[PDB]
Design a protein around this nucleic acid. Structure first.
Length: 97
RNA sequence: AUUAAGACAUUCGUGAGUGAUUUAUUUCCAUGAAGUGGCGU
């Protein structure tokens, strides 16, 4: 059985959502960045995954530390393998734990 | 872990240079140093 939550986001300051043109791309005019009005749903997914491991205290802190083969499947059962990969759009399941 | 992260609109810069408070203007106009004699027909 599943548990459902309503998550409300209140901005504490000015925000910005990146578009196709970002301040440090290799293209020509890489000094003007414009903000999309909404975040991508992948950003929402990354938000939830980050907070989920924050509550469970499982992060990468500094060097590129590797994780022992218990944090590995705890992150499997927590968030899964990948980010929102649009390649697997025809998959009849969320690829996230 | 999310088209992310990182970045003082900052460095240099005298409100400064040129410029008489000067020009024009009579301390002047009016005006008597003057008036009277007095005493014994």
């Amino acid at each position: 059985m599943n548990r459902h939550y309503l998550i409300t986001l209140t901005p504490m300051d000015w925000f910005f959502f990146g578009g196709e043109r970002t301040l440090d791309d290799g293209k020509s005019a890489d000094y003007i960045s414009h903000s999309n009005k909404f975040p991508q749903q992948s950003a929402l997914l990354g938000m939830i995954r980050y907070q989920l491991l924050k509550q469970h205290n499982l992060l990468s802190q500094f060097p590129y530390t590797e994780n022992k083969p218990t944090e590995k499947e705890i992150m499997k059962t927590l968030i899964g393998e990948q980010s929102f990969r649009m390649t697997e759009r025809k998959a009849k399941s969320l690829g996230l734990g």
